[PDB]
Design a binder for these strands. Structure first.
Lengths: 1540, 260
RNA sequence: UGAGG
RNA sequence: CCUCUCU
RNA sequence: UGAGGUAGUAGGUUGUAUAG
RNA sequence: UAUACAACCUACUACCUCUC
């Protein structure tokens, strides 16, 4: 059912009344809710339909506390008017100005009484009057006098009166309860409204069961000791000496000493010894807290008397001998009887069984009895390990320590509670099996409250009394009982307490009775927060209201209106059919509302609420049709994709007599000349180059950056082809042979299964040398090609052959490539220069003088090489050529005779080393322009001057932030422990974090540990309290105006609004969009993925909001998740035929690359494609064995019959072998042009491609692309492009809910033209009064998307220098509900939310107090706090959702994404700056990167070591990841508590 | 570590390695002069390792462009023994980081008050904890007078030999009772005796026996017979106030009761 | 000044 | 007449 | 890649001397 | 409990040489 609180609030709305609830913490909320219900006319001036509210209190302290409660829990200006401000000294004029400015007036009864009498304010102007502590009405009290002003008044316009009373009757006034309560009801013109005793609230007066009352009488036994007389004489001498001193005051000193004397009379010598220690502590604290010397002297002498009294009491104790005997013998008979009673009642009973409360009158008695009890318990080996004492009193530290003590009792750690007398308010403790009132009862409230704690009928209520007062106390208790029963009788009657069934077109039945249940089930399905479900609200139409709705029919019958939650489709009131019985009238309202719902749908054939699965199945064909063709359904790993070369490279093998195109490749070293880089600088810039010869023309390509071992260089492909026509077949044979020579010999890429490929099917083009043979044009180098069909082998030389041939000539080795037959095997090296001066005999230039070089070469390899034959020739200077074939992740003076001379130019050998890398970048750059041209055409931007045929590509840009870790030699790579003890823990409250000290720094309780404390600990308690270790003119909505820790236009929005700012899509951006992270290249797609993902979410949100306007956020969120899911984008991109052209493998040219113009033998390759049966079996081992050579590898293209049969047999035999694994797919995939790509890289590509369109073209053009990818099926009526301006979607009526909307609008930084959007944004599903608009939930769906895109666009453009991994973390942190909740609290927008949930209000107040403590800034403590998503909760989701709804409402009103940006930036600028300097990380990442805590993760349970304690905390979450995150959050909380 | 980093920087720059000069220095602390190529630096600490790791920090800071000289653990223990406070427990409770340069956290707990010191060496971290605690606990011939008045260790090695719990706040009242037996019996035979003509003479004799020099001062009061404040020079900080006539009987009474 | 004693 | 509260 | 050497850092141990 | 000197052991860091 509804809250006891919300049922009270409605009654008080209909009629005047005296709200009575013994149990506390409910009246504040009830007062706040009754105040807001009478706040409709607050804003209007008092001249024109204006009303103001009053809050009168008996005391200044209570008036102040209520004034602040109303300031913290409401959005209405509050004015505190009490005596201390000289209100008596005011004028009619001043009072009129005060009632104009303020809206609620909080004060004391005396202030307002004069105000209404002097006619400064009138009863008619006021709207509600709330009397806190209204039991004070009786007599001539100003509360009663104010109500008498209500007898002589308009009698038409009289304000509602609400009386909140904790205690119905004043202390010890029980003569005639009935007459007194009747007089109280006559005084306040309203019946007392209480709540029946229930689980929700317990009423002490309306309970029937009574415990077994026991009267234990204790003997006088007045044997007077002399120690008490001596102490008394000494204290009175002190009193005489103190009054005379002329001066943390004398009164305080008298107070404490008199209280000790009370403890010594009432509780005996042993208890007094425990209590003098308390005085010693308090007099020591005050001596330190003394400004002037005179006071310090007074406190020092008081302390010295305390030390003397401590001694006299202690010696009396020792004369007898903390033993039981010392305590019992030397104590008062009252205490003796209580201790004896304690022993008999709790003797060896199970500890979890006993729960008892001992009640004392004074607050210091608690401490002195707690000490006595703890020592007695330690002493008695029977009552030890049976009872645990604890005390409570009915400063930050004092409140914190009391809260801890009460929580100890509730969880059963502490069996006994010593409570100070109840006084004004009851005790928050569970039903106690034994209640023992140690100190004589003096009040009726005390008796009722104490007895009410012994709830169980078996519980014993013992009250200890004097023999002399026995007869008197019996009467007082008996009169209280008679009185209590009389209050019970009076409050018993004040307690807050046919139809034709519808037949479906398909046969079904909807009986009306089932309909109330059916409506409740439907309400459960609607999107709901943790705080609870919202049930429909029924209201019996007033007789006067019945007139408008119905005429003759509404006579002699009743009508019930049903209002469904504001989230549901039925936002219209459904008045029932006029019927005789109120009970039937509800069965009619429910039946009618259910029938209306069925028409709208929202119900199955059997009238069962429609599930999410059924809702999505309906939208399946409209949107997710392309899923079915891939054997998948939206209702109820990785994939392999064939690779297809660019169309420019397909069928590009040159022919004979047909024009061919040679594109020259220019390498330009972007490094200067110094000895290390001299050879590279000159050799790269040599006029001789090489060219990509092919039949198809090539597009303009971008300059690409390659990082050599000596520095960086730029590779450029010539825009202007060189057109050459081949004369015959011999020239083409030379071309292909030289191409094969380059890859086989110079680059060692050849495999034993590679055959030159003369069929022009795929990746068929050649590489040709060029010389400046002609004056201007560079002729093809036929001479070089004829000369080097195959590179010469290093035969070495015979010692005699050496002697014969004239091997050494200076000119021959000017620039060639040479290798040494000895040592380095086939290591080719470049002759940089040949020193003419140096000779084998020359002294080694090397600072290590070995004299003649002839010495070292012979010494190193005497056996390997004969002594050099020619002793007088130039020495070659060589520089090694690196054996690395991938180039994008950022001096031996040998003897000539000994080196085999390859006659290759050597200007070309380096350039050809970079060729494999250049070809793999040309391959993907060609695909990139294919995708560029394809998308510009669909957008019809192809004809634009910059995007047209005149388009010049821009040099590729290097992301300088990618980690790109490098293994040695340029390959890209794909502590101390200590022992600790074991423990466990309980979840930390938000309140604990508010305190600014670590747990270890907290001072000990001197109060609960009086005998074990040292003077050192007392010094610490004082200095910590000093802080040496750790308002009525300003509105609630005021921002502090300082650093918490003209907005520049976003370029994307500028490109969207204006055509002029559009810049061309670039080939470079498209290469980044296709290049995955695995490619291990300088650029990737992880950044465009961010902008693209944000756009896709923004566009899917706007599309679903426009197409299906009348859905709940639940269904829209679910359908949006399916639209943006990895599976949907996978299927869309696969349908788009783009995933074949993707860069997703690391470039190893030696193991996994099939070079252009060469392939597997046509025979084997055909076997693979024609026969899928044998495809699986073929493995790398089988292919290597082919070893075809000579004719089969070059001139012929098919493996020989013998080889073919051998291959086939070997592979099928492989089934019966060690290699039966058949996971051979990865190794042989490159051989047949297949690439396995993870399903995530495909969706990341689709988003990256959207991102390239969003960045360069703008939102409008990007929307058209979604139709291309078939993500959004655009309806004929509404264009996809106009999604932004599509309709996503009484002044006094709206402004009634929005009271101080001026301050909301000032803090937001935007003024709303239409406030309907503002009211919708602030409304909450629970709010039952707003029938104009819907809830935040609808606007929140739109706001989350808008905010995410706008923030993502900012982080993308501004924060270029962050690893794409951080730009994700930054985005996640900024958009988190916690971050939004903090900004909502900081900007003071929490006050304007419209809800009626008690839990929600409770948690919002706690979170606002915590944030105010922190300083309105997003700290780690807020991030670790539990949130609604993690799944009680201390971070409400409503605070962030309201901020998102306000951001949506700003856009909906303005219809400008630049104004919405300006608002968002002014709100988030502090967060943006802070999170850019220090980006926060995941909770799992924090826990695993913590230096001292090694996380062990199992309802996932994390065992971590924190400062010598191994604590395991369990995380409960619906999902395994959600449970792990909860465990990590609970852990991080414990680490934050006990840190170093 | 600082030394390791300076060591590695020299290797990387391909320059001369640092030369370290340690002298005995002032008080008990050595001073370390780092000699580096083209620069000179200074850093002094309690131990040679401590001085070296400070020298290193100072020179390293000038290239890019405190250490007490006593045993603070021992000093804190001596201070606690002197003031009668529960003896400190300093224990390394957490080791974490690379075995080449680790991080050690050590707790120091005088009674319930804990302060943490963290460093790169087990000993340095203990010293760090001890220093932090001493400052918090803190915020000389008297101890000679208090030694004659009552048996007291006044240093840790004297205590370690004999083998304190610490005076609880509840048990501070026994201060006069714990005075040396010879002094007490005499001050009692002085109190019980009535040979003295004046109570002023008795009061002075009993206080003189206990070696307490009284501080009689003028307390401002609205009374004909002067109100005087008798202050005492003892750890207990006894302070009494009475009228002139009663001042000397109250001294006698306090002493009798407390001495009993 | 109002309530209680 | 006193306590508490109020002005 | 493996092996060896030099300088350092941190822990533990042992023995001597010193202060406390 | 610190300090100074010498030895042993363990874990690690920088550099160098040789080899692959």
């Amino acid at each position: 059912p509804r809250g006891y609180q919300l049922r009270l609030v409605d009654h008080l709305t209909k009629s005047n009344g005296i709200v009575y609830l013994p149990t506390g913490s409910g009246k504040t909320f009830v007062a706040i809710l009754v105040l807001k219900r009478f706040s409709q006319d607050f804003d209007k001036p008092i001249e024109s339909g204006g009303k103001r509210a009053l809050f009168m209190c008996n005391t200044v302290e209570l008036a102040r506390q209520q004034a602040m409660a109303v300031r913290r829990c409401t959005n209405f200006k509050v004015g505190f008017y009490v005596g201390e401000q000289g209100v008596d000294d005011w004028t009619r004029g001043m009072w009129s100005d005060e009632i104009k400015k303020n809206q609620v007036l909080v004060g004391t009864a005396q202030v307002f009484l004069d105000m209404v009498t002097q006619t400064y304010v009138a009863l008619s102007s006021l709207s509600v009057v709330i009397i806190d502590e209204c039991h004070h009405g009786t007599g001539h009290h100003p509360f009663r006098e104010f109500m008498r002003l209500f007898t002589i008044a308009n009698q038409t316009k009289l304000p509602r009166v609400v009386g909140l009373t904790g205690v119905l009757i004043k202390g010890n006034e029980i003569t005639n309860v009935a007459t007194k309560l009747k007089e109280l009801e006559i005084t306040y013109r309203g019946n007392i409204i209480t709540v029946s005793d229930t689980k929700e609230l317990e009423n002490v007066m309306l309970y029937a069961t009574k415990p077994t009352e026991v009267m234990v009488s204790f003997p006088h036994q007045e044997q007077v000791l002399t120690v008490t007389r001596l102490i008394s004489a000494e204290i009175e001498k002190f009193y005489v000496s103190l009054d005379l001193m002329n001066i943390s005051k004398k009164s305080f000193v008298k107070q404490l000493f008199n209280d000790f004397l009370y403890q010594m009379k009432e509780y005996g010598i042993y208890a007094a010894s425990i209590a003098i220690i308390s005085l010693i502590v308090e007099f020591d604290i005050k001596r330190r807290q003394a400004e002037t010397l005179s006071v310090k002297l007074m406190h020092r002498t008081a302390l010295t008397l305390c030390e003397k009294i401590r001694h006299l009491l202690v010696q009396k104790l020792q004369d007898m001998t903390n033993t039981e005997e010392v305590i019992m013998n030397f104590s008062t008979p009252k205490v003796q009887r209580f201790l004896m009673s304690l022993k008999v009642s709790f003797a060896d009973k199970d500890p979890k069984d006993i729960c008892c409360l001992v009640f004392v009158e004074r607050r210091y008695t608690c401490k002195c009895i707690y000490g006595l009890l703890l020592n007695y318990i330690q002493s008695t080996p029977e009552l030890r390990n049976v009872l645990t004492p604890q005390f409570m009193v009915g400063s930050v530290l004092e409140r914190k320590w009391q809260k801890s003590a009460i929580q100890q009792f509730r969880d059963g750690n502490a069996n006994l509670m010593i409570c100070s007398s109840v006084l004004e308010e009851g005790i928050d403790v569970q039903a106690c099996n034994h209640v023992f009132i140690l100190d004589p009862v003096k009040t009726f409230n005390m008796y009722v409250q104490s007895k009410g704690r012994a709830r169980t009928t078996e519980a014993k209520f013992v009250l200890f009394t004097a023999d002399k007062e026995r007869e008197k106390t019996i009467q007082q208790i008996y009169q209280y009982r008679k009185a209590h029963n009389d209050i019970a009788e009076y409050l018993k009657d004040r307690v807050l307490e046919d139809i034709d069934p519808f037949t479906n077109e398909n046969g079904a039945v909807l009986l009306p009775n089932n309909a109330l249940a059916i409506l409740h089930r439907y309400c459960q399905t609607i999107p709901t927060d943790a705080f609870g479900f919202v049930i429909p609200w029924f209201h019996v139409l007033q007789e006067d209201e019945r007139d408008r709705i119905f005429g003759v029919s509404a006579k002699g019958k009743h009508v019930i209106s049903i209002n469904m939650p504001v989230n549901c489709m039925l936002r219209d009131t459904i008045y029932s059919d006029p019927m005789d019985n109120v009970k039937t009238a509800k069965i009619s309202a429910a039946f009618k509302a259910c029938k209306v719902l069925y028409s709208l749908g929202e119900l199955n054939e059997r009238f069962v609420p429609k599930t999410l699965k059924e809702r999505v199945a309906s939208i399946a064909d409209v949107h997710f049709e392309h899923w079915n063709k891939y054997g998948d359904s939206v209702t109820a790993k990785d994939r392999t994709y064939k690779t297809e070369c660019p169309l420019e490279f397909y069928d590009a093998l040159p022919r004979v007599g047909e024009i061919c195109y040679a594109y020259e490749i220019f390498l330009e070293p972007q490094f200067e000349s110094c000895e290390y880089t001299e050879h590279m600088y000159l050799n790269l810039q040599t006029p001789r180059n090489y060219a990509i010869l092919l039949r198809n023309k090539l597009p303009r390509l971008a300059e690409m950056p390659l990082f050599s071992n000596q520095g960086k260089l730029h590779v450029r492909v010539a825009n202007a082809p060189l057109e050459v026509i081949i004369q015959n077949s011999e020239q083409l044979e030379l071309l292909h042979q030289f191409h094969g020579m380059v890859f086989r010999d110079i680059l060692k890429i050849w495999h034993p299964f590679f055959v030159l490929d003369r069929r022009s099917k795929e990746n068929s083009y050649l590489v040709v040398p060029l010389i400046l043979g002609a004056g201007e044009q560079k002729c093809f180098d036929w001479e070089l090609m004829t000369n080097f069909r195959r590179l010469p082998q290093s035969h070495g030389s015979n010692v005699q052959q050496r002697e014969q041939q004239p091997a050494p000539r200076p000119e021959d080795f000017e620039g060639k490539i040479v290798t040494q037959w000895y040592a380095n095997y086939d290591k080719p090296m470049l002759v940089t220069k040949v020193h003419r001066e140096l000779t084998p005999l020359s002294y080694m230039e090397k600072n290590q003088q070995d004299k003649t070089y002839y010495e070292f070469t012979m010494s190193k390899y005497g056996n390997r090489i004969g002594d050099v034959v020619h002793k007088d020739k130039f020495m070659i200077e060589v520089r090694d050529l690196t054996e690395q074939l991938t180039f994008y992740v950022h001096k031996v003076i040998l003897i000539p005779e000994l080196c085999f001379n390859f006659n290759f130019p050597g200007d070309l050998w380096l350039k050809l080393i970079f060729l494999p890398s250049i070809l793999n970048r040309m391959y993907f750059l060609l695909h990139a322009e294919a995708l560029r041209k394809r998308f510009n055409t669909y957008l019809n931007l192809h004809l634009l001057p910059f995007n047209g045929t005149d388009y010049m590509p821009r040099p590729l840009e290097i992301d300088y932030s990618l980690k790109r870790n490098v293994d040695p030699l340029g390959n890209v790579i794909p502590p101390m422990p200590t022992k600790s003890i074991e423990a466990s823990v309980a979840n930390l409250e938000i309140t604990e974090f508010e305190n600014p000290w670590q747990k270890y720094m907290e001072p000990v309780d001197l109060s609960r540990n009086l005998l074990s404390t040292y003077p050192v600990e007392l010094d610490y308690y004082y200095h910590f309290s000093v802080g040496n270790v750790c308002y009525w003119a300003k509105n609630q909505f005021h921002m502090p105006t300082g650093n918490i820790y003209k907005v520049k236009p976003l370029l994307i929005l500028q490109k969207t609004v204006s055509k002029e700012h559009i810049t061309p899509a670039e080939q470079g951006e498209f290469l980044a969009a296709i290049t995955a992270s695995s490619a291990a290249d300088v650029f990737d797609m992880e950044r465009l993925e961010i902008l693209g993902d944000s756009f896709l979410k923004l566009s899917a949100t706007l599309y679903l909001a426009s197409k299906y306007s009348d859905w709940n956020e639940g269904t829209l969120t679910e359908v949006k998740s399916k639209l943006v899911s990895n599976r949907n984008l996978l299927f869309c991109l696969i349908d788009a035929d783009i995933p074949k052209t993707l860069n997703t493998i690391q470039f190893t040219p030696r193991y996994t690359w099939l070079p252009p113009g060469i392939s597997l033998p046509h025979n084997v390759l055909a076997l693979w494609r024609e026969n899928p049966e044998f495809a699986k079996i073929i493995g790398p081992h089988n292919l290597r064995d082919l070893a075809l050579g000579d004719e089969e590898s070059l001139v012929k293209g098919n493996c020989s019959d013998i080889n073919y049969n051998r291959f086939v047999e070997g592979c099928r035999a492989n089934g019966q072998s060690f290699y039966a694994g058949a996971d051979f797919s990865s190794e042989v995939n490159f051989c047949v042009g297949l690439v396995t790509i993870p399903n995530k890289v495909i969706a990341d590509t689709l988003e990256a491609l959207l991102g390239v369109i969003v960045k360069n073209y703008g939102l409008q053009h990007a929307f058209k692309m979604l139709e291309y990818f078939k993500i959004c099926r655009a309806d004929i009526d509404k264009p996809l492009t106009q999604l932004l301006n599509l309709e996503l979607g009484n002044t006094t009526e709206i402004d009634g809910f929005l009271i101080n909307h001026y301050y909301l609008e000032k803090n937001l930084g935007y003024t709303f033209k239409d406030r309907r959007y503002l009211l919708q944004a602030l409304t909450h599903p629970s709010y039952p009064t707003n029938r104009i608009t819907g809830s935040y939930q609808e606007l929140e769906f739109i706001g989350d998307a808008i905010l995410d895109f706008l923030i993502s666009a900012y982080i993308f453009e501004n924060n270029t220098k962050m690893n794409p991994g951080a730009l994700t973390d930054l985005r996640s942190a900024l958009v988190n509900n916690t971050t939004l909740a903090c900004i909502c609290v900081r900007h003071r927008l929490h006050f304007f939310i419209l809800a009626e949930n008690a839990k929600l209000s409770e948690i919002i107040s706690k979170f606002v107090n915590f944030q105010e403590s922190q300083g309105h800034r997003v700290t780690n403590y807020v991030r670790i706090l539990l949130e609604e998503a993690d799944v009680n909760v201390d971070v409400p989701k409503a605070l962030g959702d309201v901020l998102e709804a306000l951001i949506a409402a700003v856009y909906l009103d303005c219809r400008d994404l630049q104004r919405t940006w300006e608002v968002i930036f002014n709100l988030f600028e502090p967060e943006l700056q802070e999170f850019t300097r220090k980006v926060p990380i995941n909770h799992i990442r924090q826990l695993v990167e913590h230096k001292h805590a090694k996380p062990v993760f199992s309802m996932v349970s994390c065992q971590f070591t924190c400062m010598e304690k191994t604590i395991k905390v369990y995380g409960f979450g619906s999902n395994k990841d959600q449970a792990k995150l909860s465990a990590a959050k609970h852990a991080l909380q414990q680490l934050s508590k006990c840190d170093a | 570590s600082a030394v390791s980093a300076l060591q590695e920087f020299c290797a990387r720059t391909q320059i001369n390695l640092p030369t370290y000069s340690f002298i005995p220095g002032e008080d008990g602390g050595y001073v370390c002069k780092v000699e580096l190529l083209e620069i000179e630096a200074l850093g002094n600490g309690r131990s040679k390792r401590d001085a070296k790791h400070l020298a290193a920090s100072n020179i390293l800071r000038k290239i890019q462009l405190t250490n007490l000289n006593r045993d603070m653990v021992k000093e804190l223990r001596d201070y606690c023994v002197r003031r009668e406070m529960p003896l400190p427990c300093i224990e390394v409770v957490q080791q974490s980081g690379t075995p080449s340069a680790p991080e050690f956290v050590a707790c120091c707990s005088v009674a319930s008050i804990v302060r943490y010191g963290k460093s790169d060496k087990k000993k340095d971290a203990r010293q760090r904890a001890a220093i932090e605690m001493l400052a918090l606990i803190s915020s000389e011939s008297m101890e000679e007078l208090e030694a004659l008045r009552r048996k007291k260790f006044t240093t840790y090695w004297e205590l370690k030999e004999a083998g304190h719990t610490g005076m609880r706040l509840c048990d501070r009242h026994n201060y006069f009772k714990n005075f040396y037996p010879t002094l007490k019996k005499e001050a009692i035979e002085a109190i019980n005796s009535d040979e003295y003509e004046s109570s002023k003479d008795k009061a002075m004799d009993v206080m003189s026996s206990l070696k307490i020099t009284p501080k009689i001062s003028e307390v401002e009061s609205s009374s004909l017979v002067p109100l005087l404040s008798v202050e005492l020079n003892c750890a207990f900080d006894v302070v009494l106030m009475a009228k002139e006539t009663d001042i000397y009987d109250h001294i006698i009474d306090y002493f009798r009761t407390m001495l009993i």
